[PDB]
């Protein structure tokens with residue numbers, strides 16, 4: 137069940153999906169498509185492999201360098217990084233030129249949702265999360281404490297009062313909103329231009345508020361990243377094709393999903409755009425859906441969805457990132473076109489497609505991404521420059537060369553984002569040989585992470601992002617702890633981030649309040665010109681000093697890390713579920729994703745390498761945490777317990793192998809082990 141398409145031996149499920157579902161309506165001759173795809177693969181594969189080899193070669197050099205330099209000669213270290221080509225010169229100041237970009241990205245500051253593309257139900261909700269009920273968000277979360285079955289009026293009243301107080305912040309009266317006796321320029325029984333329409337529609341900081349006359353709706357997830365990478369499990373052509381079909385469906389605009397509850401079924405569909413009467417009596421139409429990005433995989437992994445003849449290989453698995461650019465690009469044409477075969481809805485209003493590119497190391501790797509995109513646009517007949525790139529700043533070689541990384545994509549970049557979880561994973565792996573690292577929770581307060589976050593913004597603004605491309609920060613992982621999020625996450629817009637990552641539609645609605653409270657444009661303007669971080673700060677390796685930890689602190693870290701690896705991996709391996717809510721050793725429900733795994737496994741691998749803990753301690757902790765995870769999953773009938781037969785569980789062995797072999801994984805990446813182990817489970 138592979139179709140010969142010249143040099144490509146394509147899994148039929150993929151071949152049929154492309155020819156039967158994706159190609160018609162694109163005006164791309166099917167034979168030209170496969171031939172052109174063959175050629176991109178032939179031409180770009182050697183450079184892809186070469187880039188990966190450079191990764192390994194640099195890491196080998198750093199490992200060796202630390203063998204005797206074990207401490208700290210900062211100057212010698214820095215000059216070594218220069219000599220080996222790890223740290224490259226900063227180019228001169230420039231301004232990005234990226235154009236054809238939507239207003240959601242250039243003009244608006246607000247939340248950005250990330251969702252697993254493989255889950256249609258979740259994807260649909262994510263795309264529809266552009267608008268959400270503040271009342272539902274308040275009532276349904278701990279943002280309104282339970283202090284002091286059916287609706288509860290004493291809660292609803294707190295909800296109403298909270299929204300009222302929010303109204304006084306975002307759309308202030310001339311002379312609280314509470315005292316309003318009714319509404320009719322708008323009148324209530326400060327800035328009159330914040331009345332934009334009715335069907336009552338208000339705008340503050342470029343974001344809409346709708347008061348139903350009853351409820352307050354907030355424009356919430358302005359943009360949404362449909363994720364093929366860390367939040368999904370996709371290890372073969374079957375899984376990939378599920379992902380590509382959902383993405384195709386979102387871009388056609390006809391993705392639907394049946395939802396059955398309480399003996400009733402409703403079909404989930406995409407929301408229409410929203411019409412209003414303007415105050416002059418004219419018409420206004422606003423987007424009903426989040427502007428969609430897609431997160432492709434990075435440069436590392438290969439996929440047997442296509443096996444390749446020619447070049448330097450023998451039926452070589454194709455590079456996954458290459459095929460993601462092709463197939464996510466192809467599907468996204470329908471989100472730009474308006475013919476009969478292209479579905480009822482479009483995504484961009486401006487002729488762009490937005491791909492998030494993760495896990496890139498350094499400017500050559502950004503240049504290669506841009507060439508891939510260029511070659512794909514050629515095969516697809518999209519104008520050059522249509523595939524715009526969201527750059528994840530989440531690898532040390534990228535952070536340290538960030539200005540050159542942006543310049544390498546100056547014509548295509550629509551964001552940068554501090555993917556802080558991967559970035560910490562890379563920090564640990566890169567300096568693995570330097571000595572034992574501080575605890576995961578100490579990393580938050582480290583010199584390097586502070587310079588990483590600040591540099592990103594500075595370099596962004598210095599490259600002229602204000603008004604042209606987002607500057608983003610990272611995910612809030614604690615899904616039930618929304619009072620904490622409303623309290624803490626205001627820090628990101630206050631730091632000049634025009635966007636930050638949220639885990640669900642409800643979190644998007646609550647985080648949107650922060651952008652009403654903080655004028656991110658003015659914050660960005662006050663940041664303009666400032667230089668708040670240094671290369672020497674970034675190069676401060678977060679090594680633990682001696683006598684850093686009482687033995688209980690060591691033990692708390694180990695169990696916490698093992699429980700989190702196990703809770704996430706067991707669902708990954710046994711169920712093919714890539715984004716799980718997993719309760720830590722302190723109880724709290726977290727969004728675990730592959731990057732959370734990278735951090736935990738690398739920290740443990742580092743502690744093992746330097747004798748902070750033993751192999752025996754690791755096994756012991758894993759065995760102790762297994763049944764806790766089994767217990768957490770008990771009410772799920774699809775779950776199979778890991779205990780007591782730990783060595784018969786592929787999931788368990790996968791968690792063990794991530795830690796015990798963690799030091800040998802390229803840059804600490806979890807895919808080689810996880811992909812291997814998921815395939816093993818499927819074939820069992």
Ligand SMILES: [Mg+2]
Nearest residue numbers: 387388470481
């Ligand atoms: Mg369409």
Ligand SMILES: [Mg+2]
Nearest residue numbers: 482483484485
């Ligand atoms: Mg649209």
Ligand SMILES: [Mg+2]
Nearest residue numbers: 530555558731
């Ligand atoms: Mg990441």
